[PDB]
C-alpha cells in the first residue's frame, strides 16, 4: 500500500446524498488533479457517521478536523487552506458550546460522549467497496477460529452465556432460537436461514446503516450462522427503493466469490454455504416472520398463524431462523473479545448496549447508541443539545406506532424491557420522536392510526373493521361533532382488540391510544367540552382573532378571504365572522404585519 | 403414528398426532364455534370466533387450527374469552347487512345462529359498509358483496376442489373484496356454474 | 432513462418468462422486471404471463393489486413525492400537502392531464433527518418550508 500524507473520508449516507454529496465527491477529486496532490491525498466513501444534521461530513486525517455544512461554493478553498497550508478554518468547524473550543476527537463532543460503537465500531470507518480495508482492520478473523477449532455445539453455549435477547421488539433470548433450530430434524437433512433487513416503520432508518457502512460483516455472520445449525443455503431480503444500497451489496458478494469466502469448501473446510439476493419492494408487513416466507414463495402476503412455529416448518418443509441484521453484527465481537465482554455492560436482566434513531424537534439529528441502563432525562438535555428554540417538551414517542408516548413525568425512566412495558410501551426498532407544545396531541394519535389502516394485511376482522370504525370517533371530536361519553366507547375496544388479533399489527395497534389517555385525559375534555384546541392545530376547532393595536386596517386579508367572513372600513382593524368562514386560514399569511392569531 | 396426551377441562385424552382440539373435543362432546373451518379444504381460521385460552400463553389462540401438544391444560369457560367472542360478534355485525327479514337465506343463516348463540343485545355502533353493486348480468349466479363477510370458503372450494379458481381477493381493508379478475362478471369469464 | 416498450410487444415478455422459470416463487421478481421495462401493467400483458406459466390469473392479479409499488395505470413523466413519515409530519407537512393541492389544483393521488405532474403517497424515502423532504425523480430537497414550494415546483 502506498503511503499517504493526508486522508479524507466522505459521508455516503442517505441524508448526505440528499444534499448532493455525489456532487462534492466529483468536485473533490477534480481539485486533486489541479493541485497535483492526488497521489498523496486519499478520498474514501465511507458510511454514515451518526450525525446527518451536519451532513455532508469531511474529516481530514491524521488531523481529525470536523467540518460541518460544507457546500459546493467552497470546493477549491478547502484543498488549499488545509491540505496545502496545513491550517484549519474555524467557520466550518462545529462548535457545540460556541466559545471557540474545537474538539480533537469525535467522542469529546456532547453528541458522541455516551455513544459506545460496538456493532458500529468499524462501520463508517472503512471503505466498503475495498475488501483490503476490512481485513486490514481486523476483519474475517472470526471464521478462521470457528472453521478449524470450534464445534457447532460449543458456539450456542457462548450465546446463552452472553445473554443476548432480540431487539426486534419481542424480547426473546437469541440462543434459545439457535437451540430451537438445532434439535429439529428434517426428512432430507436440508436447512435454510433468513435475514431481516426490511424496515418500513416511519422514523426508523438504522437498518441499512450497517449495509451502507459494511456489507462484509453481514455476510461474515451468515457463514457463522450456517456453521452452527448446519445450513447449506441462505436468503437475504432487501427493499427495492434503496438504489444505492442494493448495488454495492451485490459487489461485496463478488469479492466473496473472488477469494472463495462465500460458497463451497469454505477456507479448506467441509462447510458449504451460499447467498443470493431477494428483491422486496417495501412492504412493511413483510417484516413479520412468516409473512416473508410466503412473500418469497410468491403468494399473497398473509401472516400464517402460529403455531406451527417458523423454527420447525419453513422453506419447503425445512427448518429456518428469523432475526434482524444488527443483532448479527455483534456476533464476531462475541468470539473475538469474549462473551463476558458483552456481559460487562448493562443491568443483570439483559446485557450490552442498544442502538436507536432519534427524531422530532431536536437540535442535532442522527443516530444514537447508548449502553443499557440510562435515564431518559439525560437523553434530551445534554445528548441531543436540548430542545431547539426554547420550546416546551410535552411527550417523547418511542417505537413509532408500535409504542407509546412518554410525558414529562417519566424523565428519570430507565429505558429497558421491564420498565417501559410497565410504562406501557415497547422499543421496537428504537425510533425516538420528541414532541413539544406547538402541536396538538389529539390528531397525532390519529397520525399513527393513519399508518395502521393503510398497511393492514386484511385478514383478521378486527384489523380490518375495528380500525376504520375507530377513526370516526376521533375525527368527530376533531371537527366538533362528538358527544360526551365517546371516550368511554373507545375504552370498550381497548382490551377487546388486543386479545383478538392474529397479525402482529393488531396487538400493537391501539397502544398509542392506550398510552395517551392515562396521562392526557383532561385535554380531550377541552376538545369535547370547551370545543377548543390547546395548540390551535385542529382546523375546525380553531378561530381567528385580530389585535386592534397591531392591525393597520389596510384590508389585504379582506381580499384573501374566500368566504368573505371579514369586512369593514379602511384604516381600522376589521371584524371577523367566526361561523361564516371555512377556517381555511388563507388570510393569516397575507397580512404583512402578522396581525392574525389563533384562538 | 404418534400418540399425544392432553387434558381439556381436566379430562385426559390420547389422540393421534396432527388432530386438533376442535374435533377431539367434539369427540368428547364439547363444541367450539366455527364459521371459517370446513373439513379437508379450509384451515386458516380467519373467522376469529373459535377462541379459547391456553395456560402458559402470552395472548389467546384460536381452537380451529391450534395443534395439540403434550401436557397442556385447556379451560373454555373464562369470562375473557366470552367477551372476546362477543366483541368480535358486534364488529362482524356492524359490517354485515342487518335487514335479515328479506334475506334469501333467512331462516338458517349461520350469522343469525351465532348472534343468538352468543346472546348479544346492544349494537352501539354506526359505521359505513362496502359498496352496493348488483351484478345481475350473468345467467345463474348473482353476487351481493354487501352481505359477503370474507369467509374465503368460496375461493378455496373453487380453488382446490373445482381446480377452476376464477376468483380472488383484491384491494386493501374495505377495498379487499372477493371478485373475478379484471372487474368483470361471471358470464364474462369461464365460470363452470358448478354450484 | 431508457425507453418504455409499448404494450403490443409480447416477445420480450415470453423471453423473460423463458429466462425466469426455474427459480421458485418467480412471480414477484418477474412482475418487477416487467414494471422496470414497461412502466405499467395493462391486462393482456399479465394475461399472456398466465398463459405462459400455466397458472390462472387470480393470484397474479391479486399480487398486482396487493402492493402499492405496482401500478395498473400508465403514469406521467415526473413523479411528485412528499415524505409522509412522522419526522416530516411533525414539522407540519400537512401545510406542504395543502400548498401542493393549492398550487397544482389536483388532489393527492391524482394525475394531471399533461402527463407531467403526477402525485402519490410516498411514506418514507429514508432521509427523514432533513425534514421537510420533497422528492422528484432522483432529486431530494430538505429542510424546506411552504415558501420554497413554488420555486422548486417551477424548476421542472
Ligand atoms: C409487520 C411486522 C414488521 C416487523 N418488522 C420488523 C423489522 O423491521 N425489524 C425487526 O427487527 N423486527 C420486525 N418485526 C418483529 C419480527 O417479527 C421479529 O420479532 C424479529 O425479526 C425478531 O427479533 P426478536 O428476537 O426480538 O423477536 C416485525 C413484525 C411484524 C409483525
Ligand atoms: S391484524 Fe389481522 S387484518 Fe391486520 S394484518 Fe394482521 S391478520 Fe391481517
Ligand atoms: S392585512 Fe393585516 S393589517 Fe391589513 S387589514 Fe388584514 S390584518 Fe389588518
Ligand atoms: S380562515 Fe379562510 S375563510 Fe376564514 S376568514 Fe380567514 S381567509 Fe376567510
Ligand atoms: S346474512 Fe342473510 S340470512 Fe344472515 S342475517 Fe344477513 S340477511 Fe339475514
Ligand atoms: S362468497 Fe363471500 S360470504 Fe360467501 S364464503 Fe365467499 S367471501 Fe365468504
Ligand atoms: S360455480 Fe363457478 S365460481 Fe362457483 S365454484 Fe363453480 S366454477 Fe367456481
Ligand atoms: S448521513 Fe452523513 S453522517 Fe450520517
Ligand atoms: S375457523 Fe376462524 S378462528 Fe378457527
Ligand atoms: S420521515 Fe420518512 S421520509 Fe421523512
Ligand atoms: Zn387540538
PDB file of C-alpha atoms in Angstrom, chain A residues 289-483:
ATOM      1  CA  UNK A 289     -41.533 -13.757  10.438  1.00  0.00           C
ATOM      2  CA  UNK A 290     -43.776 -15.900   8.231  1.00  0.00           C
ATOM      3  CA  UNK A 291     -45.163 -13.110   6.044  1.00  0.00           C
ATOM      4  CA  UNK A 292     -41.726 -13.049   4.401  1.00  0.00           C
ATOM      5  CA  UNK A 293     -41.838 -16.822   3.935  1.00  0.00           C
ATOM      6  CA  UNK A 294     -44.900 -16.717   1.666  1.00  0.00           C
ATOM      7  CA  UNK A 295     -43.829 -13.422   0.039  1.00  0.00           C
ATOM      8  CA  UNK A 296     -40.725 -15.083  -1.413  1.00  0.00           C
ATOM      9  CA  UNK A 297     -42.755 -18.111  -2.482  1.00  0.00           C
ATOM     10  CA  UNK A 298     -44.920 -15.713  -4.497  1.00  0.00           C
ATOM     11  CA  UNK A 299     -48.327 -15.881  -2.810  1.00  0.00           C
ATOM     12  CA  UNK A 300     -50.409 -13.267  -1.001  1.00  0.00           C
ATOM     13  CA  UNK A 301     -48.618 -11.765   1.987  1.00  0.00           C
ATOM     14  CA  UNK A 302     -50.835 -13.444   4.575  1.00  0.00           C
ATOM     15  CA  UNK A 303     -49.278 -13.807   8.044  1.00  0.00           C
ATOM     16  CA  UNK A 304     -49.545 -17.557   8.776  1.00  0.00           C
ATOM     17  CA  UNK A 305     -50.862 -18.303  12.290  1.00  0.00           C
ATOM     18  CA  UNK A 306     -48.512 -19.598  14.974  1.00  0.00           C
ATOM     19  CA  UNK A 307     -48.108 -22.476  15.913  1.00  0.00           C
ATOM     20  CA  UNK A 308     -46.615 -24.302  13.850  1.00  0.00           C
ATOM     21  CA  UNK A 309     -43.510 -22.280  14.573  1.00  0.00           C
ATOM     22  CA  UNK A 310     -41.165 -20.787  11.961  1.00  0.00           C
ATOM     23  CA  UNK A 311     -38.460 -22.863  13.678  1.00  0.00           C
ATOM     24  CA  UNK A 312     -39.709 -26.346  12.731  1.00  0.00           C
ATOM     25  CA  UNK A 313     -41.517 -25.708   9.426  1.00  0.00           C
ATOM     26  CA  UNK A 314     -40.162 -23.260   6.863  1.00  0.00           C
ATOM     27  CA  UNK A 315     -38.873 -23.242   3.295  1.00  0.00           C
ATOM     28  CA  UNK A 316     -40.086 -26.432   1.582  1.00  0.00           C
ATOM     29  CA  UNK A 317     -40.768 -28.060   4.944  1.00  0.00           C
ATOM     30  CA  UNK A 318     -37.289 -27.355   6.280  1.00  0.00           C
ATOM     31  CA  UNK A 319     -36.220 -25.529   9.468  1.00  0.00           C
ATOM     32  CA  UNK A 320     -35.314 -21.829   9.346  1.00  0.00           C
ATOM     33  CA  UNK A 321     -34.322 -18.926  11.611  1.00  0.00           C
ATOM     34  CA  UNK A 322     -35.555 -15.306  11.646  1.00  0.00           C
ATOM     35  CA  UNK A 323     -33.618 -12.323  13.014  1.00  0.00           C
ATOM     36  CA  UNK A 324     -32.603  -8.783  12.071  1.00  0.00           C
ATOM     37  CA  UNK A 325     -29.179  -7.700  10.859  1.00  0.00           C
ATOM     38  CA  UNK A 326     -27.978  -5.513  13.735  1.00  0.00           C
ATOM     39  CA  UNK A 327     -28.256  -8.463  16.116  1.00  0.00           C
ATOM     40  CA  UNK A 328     -25.988 -10.401  13.753  1.00  0.00           C
ATOM     41  CA  UNK A 329     -23.388  -7.630  13.906  1.00  0.00           C
ATOM     42  CA  UNK A 330     -22.085  -8.186  17.448  1.00  0.00           C
ATOM     43  CA  UNK A 331     -21.572 -11.923  16.846  1.00  0.00           C
ATOM     44  CA  UNK A 332     -17.890 -11.595  15.771  1.00  0.00           C
ATOM     45  CA  UNK A 333     -17.460  -9.248  18.741  1.00  0.00           C
ATOM     46  CA  UNK A 334     -18.543 -12.176  20.930  1.00  0.00           C
ATOM     47  CA  UNK A 335     -15.910 -14.599  19.646  1.00  0.00           C
ATOM     48  CA  UNK A 336     -13.042 -12.100  19.384  1.00  0.00           C
ATOM     49  CA  UNK A 337     -13.374 -10.389  22.771  1.00  0.00           C
ATOM     50  CA  UNK A 338     -15.311 -12.914  24.853  1.00  0.00           C
ATOM     51  CA  UNK A 339     -18.913 -13.280  25.951  1.00  0.00           C
ATOM     52  CA  UNK A 340     -18.111 -11.625  29.292  1.00  0.00           C
ATOM     53  CA  UNK A 341     -17.204  -8.514  27.309  1.00  0.00           C
ATOM     54  CA  UNK A 342     -20.843  -8.469  26.196  1.00  0.00           C
ATOM     55  CA  UNK A 343     -21.961  -9.206  29.764  1.00  0.00           C
ATOM     56  CA  UNK A 344     -19.727  -6.428  31.130  1.00  0.00           C
ATOM     57  CA  UNK A 345     -22.242  -3.752  30.051  1.00  0.00           C
ATOM     58  CA  UNK A 346     -25.857  -3.449  31.173  1.00  0.00           C
ATOM     59  CA  UNK A 347     -28.090  -4.463  34.050  1.00  0.00           C
ATOM     60  CA  UNK A 348     -28.458  -8.002  35.400  1.00  0.00           C
ATOM     61  CA  UNK A 349     -31.559  -8.941  33.386  1.00  0.00           C
ATOM     62  CA  UNK A 350     -30.102  -8.223  29.935  1.00  0.00           C
ATOM     63  CA  UNK A 351     -26.582  -7.297  28.877  1.00  0.00           C
ATOM     64  CA  UNK A 352     -24.932  -4.980  26.387  1.00  0.00           C
ATOM     65  CA  UNK A 353     -25.682  -1.756  24.519  1.00  0.00           C
ATOM     66  CA  UNK A 354     -28.650  -0.678  22.412  1.00  0.00           C
ATOM     67  CA  UNK A 355     -28.874   1.316  19.173  1.00  0.00           C
ATOM     68  CA  UNK A 356     -31.557   3.930  18.487  1.00  0.00           C
ATOM     69  CA  UNK A 357     -32.510   6.570  15.901  1.00  0.00           C
ATOM     70  CA  UNK A 358     -33.836   9.916  17.130  1.00  0.00           C
ATOM     71  CA  UNK A 359     -36.309  12.341  15.577  1.00  0.00           C
ATOM     72  CA  UNK A 360     -38.601  15.262  16.272  1.00  0.00           C
ATOM     73  CA  UNK A 361     -37.810  18.855  17.283  1.00  0.00           C
ATOM     74  CA  UNK A 362     -34.168  18.289  18.156  1.00  0.00           C
ATOM     75  CA  UNK A 363     -31.109  20.471  17.649  1.00  0.00           C
ATOM     76  CA  UNK A 364     -28.932  17.612  16.359  1.00  0.00           C
ATOM     77  CA  UNK A 365     -30.410  14.851  14.200  1.00  0.00           C
ATOM     78  CA  UNK A 366     -28.694  11.499  13.775  1.00  0.00           C
ATOM     79  CA  UNK A 367     -28.082   8.094  15.326  1.00  0.00           C
ATOM     80  CA  UNK A 368     -27.670   7.206  18.997  1.00  0.00           C
ATOM     81  CA  UNK A 369     -26.156   4.083  20.609  1.00  0.00           C
ATOM     82  CA  UNK A 370     -26.382   4.023  24.396  1.00  0.00           C
ATOM     83  CA  UNK A 371     -25.271   1.407  26.953  1.00  0.00           C
ATOM     84  CA  UNK A 372     -28.225  -0.143  28.748  1.00  0.00           C
ATOM     85  CA  UNK A 373     -29.372   1.486  31.987  1.00  0.00           C
ATOM     86  CA  UNK A 374     -29.567   5.178  31.073  1.00  0.00           C
ATOM     87  CA  UNK A 375     -32.238   7.653  32.178  1.00  0.00           C
ATOM     88  CA  UNK A 376     -34.499   9.462  29.715  1.00  0.00           C
ATOM     89  CA  UNK A 377     -33.724  12.889  31.225  1.00  0.00           C
ATOM     90  CA  UNK A 378     -30.084  12.665  30.143  1.00  0.00           C
ATOM     91  CA  UNK A 379     -31.128  11.808  26.575  1.00  0.00           C
ATOM     92  CA  UNK A 380     -32.925  15.022  25.639  1.00  0.00           C
ATOM     93  CA  UNK A 381     -30.936  17.640  27.520  1.00  0.00           C
ATOM     94  CA  UNK A 382     -27.187  17.128  27.113  1.00  0.00           C
ATOM     95  CA  UNK A 383     -27.079  14.431  24.404  1.00  0.00           C
ATOM     96  CA  UNK A 384     -29.411  15.993  21.846  1.00  0.00           C
ATOM     97  CA  UNK A 385     -28.291  19.510  22.715  1.00  0.00           C
ATOM     98  CA  UNK A 386     -31.589  20.348  24.396  1.00  0.00           C
ATOM     99  CA  UNK A 387     -34.864  21.387  22.833  1.00  0.00           C
ATOM    100  CA  UNK A 388     -34.441  23.878  19.955  1.00  0.00           C
ATOM    101  CA  UNK A 389     -35.819  27.432  20.128  1.00  0.00           C
ATOM    102  CA  UNK A 390     -36.717  27.140  23.825  1.00  0.00           C
ATOM    103  CA  UNK A 391     -39.897  25.134  23.271  1.00  0.00           C
ATOM    104  CA  UNK A 392     -41.732  23.199  25.987  1.00  0.00           C
ATOM    105  CA  UNK A 393     -41.304  19.426  25.810  1.00  0.00           C
ATOM    106  CA  UNK A 394     -44.565  17.523  26.330  1.00  0.00           C
ATOM    107  CA  UNK A 395     -44.148  13.832  25.457  1.00  0.00           C
ATOM    108  CA  UNK A 396     -41.486  11.627  23.629  1.00  0.00           C
ATOM    109  CA  UNK A 397     -42.677   8.754  21.420  1.00  0.00           C
ATOM    110  CA  UNK A 398     -40.762   5.509  21.069  1.00  0.00           C
ATOM    111  CA  UNK A 399     -41.184   2.711  18.556  1.00  0.00           C
ATOM    112  CA  UNK A 400     -43.321   4.834  16.238  1.00  0.00           C
ATOM    113  CA  UNK A 401     -46.863   3.460  16.005  1.00  0.00           C
ATOM    114  CA  UNK A 402     -45.717   0.295  17.793  1.00  0.00           C
ATOM    115  CA  UNK A 403     -45.195   2.076  21.118  1.00  0.00           C
ATOM    116  CA  UNK A 404     -46.499   4.983  23.162  1.00  0.00           C
ATOM    117  CA  UNK A 405     -45.803   8.490  24.377  1.00  0.00           C
ATOM    118  CA  UNK A 406     -43.538   9.306  27.324  1.00  0.00           C
ATOM    119  CA  UNK A 407     -44.654  12.521  29.072  1.00  0.00           C
ATOM    120  CA  UNK A 408     -42.681  14.851  31.337  1.00  0.00           C
ATOM    121  CA  UNK A 409     -43.433  12.853  34.496  1.00  0.00           C
ATOM    122  CA  UNK A 410     -41.175   9.998  33.324  1.00  0.00           C
ATOM    123  CA  UNK A 411     -37.847  11.680  32.536  1.00  0.00           C
ATOM    124  CA  UNK A 412     -35.956   9.509  35.038  1.00  0.00           C
ATOM    125  CA  UNK A 413     -37.183   6.306  33.384  1.00  0.00           C
ATOM    126  CA  UNK A 414     -34.523   3.647  32.883  1.00  0.00           C
ATOM    127  CA  UNK A 415     -35.228   2.599  29.296  1.00  0.00           C
ATOM    128  CA  UNK A 416     -35.190  -1.211  29.247  1.00  0.00           C
ATOM    129  CA  UNK A 417     -37.546  -4.172  28.923  1.00  0.00           C
ATOM    130  CA  UNK A 418     -39.344  -4.273  32.297  1.00  0.00           C
ATOM    131  CA  UNK A 419     -39.747  -0.545  32.880  1.00  0.00           C
ATOM    132  CA  UNK A 420     -41.207   0.714  29.609  1.00  0.00           C
ATOM    133  CA  UNK A 421     -43.610  -2.217  29.352  1.00  0.00           C
ATOM    134  CA  UNK A 422     -44.605  -1.252  32.899  1.00  0.00           C
ATOM    135  CA  UNK A 423     -44.901   2.212  31.338  1.00  0.00           C
ATOM    136  CA  UNK A 424     -46.950   0.586  28.569  1.00  0.00           C
ATOM    137  CA  UNK A 425     -44.652   0.993  25.562  1.00  0.00           C
ATOM    138  CA  UNK A 426     -42.150  -1.078  23.599  1.00  0.00           C
ATOM    139  CA  UNK A 427     -38.953  -0.061  21.843  1.00  0.00           C
ATOM    140  CA  UNK A 428     -39.336  -1.996  18.584  1.00  0.00           C
ATOM    141  CA  UNK A 429     -36.778  -0.690  16.104  1.00  0.00           C
ATOM    142  CA  UNK A 430     -35.725   2.033  18.544  1.00  0.00           C
ATOM    143  CA  UNK A 431     -37.116   5.156  16.890  1.00  0.00           C
ATOM    144  CA  UNK A 432     -37.344   8.136  19.241  1.00  0.00           C
ATOM    145  CA  UNK A 433     -39.607  11.095  18.442  1.00  0.00           C
ATOM    146  CA  UNK A 434     -39.842  14.227  20.604  1.00  0.00           C
ATOM    147  CA  UNK A 435     -42.941  16.436  20.733  1.00  0.00           C
ATOM    148  CA  UNK A 436     -43.493  19.952  22.058  1.00  0.00           C
ATOM    149  CA  UNK A 437     -46.350  22.332  22.868  1.00  0.00           C
ATOM    150  CA  UNK A 438     -46.575  23.508  19.247  1.00  0.00           C
ATOM    151  CA  UNK A 439     -48.646  20.531  18.041  1.00  0.00           C
ATOM    152  CA  UNK A 440     -51.906  19.109  19.354  1.00  0.00           C
ATOM    153  CA  UNK A 441     -51.523  15.634  20.812  1.00  0.00           C
ATOM    154  CA  UNK A 442     -55.018  14.531  19.748  1.00  0.00           C
ATOM    155  CA  UNK A 443     -54.646  14.259  15.981  1.00  0.00           C
ATOM    156  CA  UNK A 444     -51.082  12.936  16.110  1.00  0.00           C
ATOM    157  CA  UNK A 445     -52.576   9.809  17.661  1.00  0.00           C
ATOM    158  CA  UNK A 446     -54.691   9.663  14.506  1.00  0.00           C
ATOM    159  CA  UNK A 447     -51.475  10.102  12.512  1.00  0.00           C
ATOM    160  CA  UNK A 448     -50.035   6.813  13.753  1.00  0.00           C
ATOM    161  CA  UNK A 449     -53.569   5.473  13.414  1.00  0.00           C
ATOM    162  CA  UNK A 450     -53.404   6.514   9.752  1.00  0.00           C
ATOM    163  CA  UNK A 451     -50.415   4.164   9.328  1.00  0.00           C
ATOM    164  CA  UNK A 452     -52.153   1.034  10.574  1.00  0.00           C
ATOM    165  CA  UNK A 453     -55.249   1.347   8.383  1.00  0.00           C
ATOM    166  CA  UNK A 454     -53.391   1.780   5.091  1.00  0.00           C
ATOM    167  CA  UNK A 455     -50.957  -1.084   5.744  1.00  0.00           C
ATOM    168  CA  UNK A 456     -53.179  -3.761   7.357  1.00  0.00           C
ATOM    169  CA  UNK A 457     -52.960  -7.077   5.522  1.00  0.00           C
ATOM    170  CA  UNK A 458     -56.714  -7.517   5.652  1.00  0.00           C
ATOM    171  CA  UNK A 459     -57.115 -10.948   7.228  1.00  0.00           C
ATOM    172  CA  UNK A 460     -58.450 -10.632  10.689  1.00  0.00           C
ATOM    173  CA  UNK A 461     -61.745  -8.747  11.056  1.00  0.00           C
ATOM    174  CA  UNK A 462     -60.527  -6.506  13.942  1.00  0.00           C
ATOM    175  CA  UNK A 463     -57.566  -5.244  11.932  1.00  0.00           C
ATOM    176  CA  UNK A 464     -59.921  -4.611   9.019  1.00  0.00           C
ATOM    177  CA  UNK A 465     -63.189  -3.453  10.518  1.00  0.00           C
ATOM    178  CA  UNK A 466     -62.305  -2.275  14.011  1.00  0.00           C
ATOM    179  CA  UNK A 467     -59.667   0.140  12.747  1.00  0.00           C
ATOM    180  CA  UNK A 468     -61.646   2.447  10.475  1.00  0.00           C
ATOM    181  CA  UNK A 469     -64.668   2.140  12.752  1.00  0.00           C
ATOM    182  CA  UNK A 470     -62.410   3.709  15.374  1.00  0.00           C
ATOM    183  CA  UNK A 471     -61.369   6.680  13.184  1.00  0.00           C
ATOM    184  CA  UNK A 472     -64.782   8.370  13.113  1.00  0.00           C
ATOM    185  CA  UNK A 473     -64.823   8.731  16.902  1.00  0.00           C
ATOM    186  CA  UNK A 474     -61.610  10.763  16.755  1.00  0.00           C
ATOM    187  CA  UNK A 475     -62.458  12.945  13.767  1.00  0.00           C
ATOM    188  CA  UNK A 476     -65.913  13.866  15.070  1.00  0.00           C
ATOM    189  CA  UNK A 477     -64.005  15.269  18.028  1.00  0.00           C
ATOM    190  CA  UNK A 478     -61.523  16.747  15.546  1.00  0.00           C
ATOM    191  CA  UNK A 479     -64.337  18.607  13.767  1.00  0.00           C
ATOM    192  CA  UNK A 480     -66.516  19.231  16.830  1.00  0.00           C
ATOM    193  CA  UNK A 481     -69.328  16.764  16.098  1.00  0.00           C
ATOM    194  CA  UNK A 482     -68.635  14.477  19.065  1.00  0.00           C
ATOM    195  CA  UNK A 483     -70.614  13.956  22.257  1.00  0.00           C
TER     196      UNK A 483
END
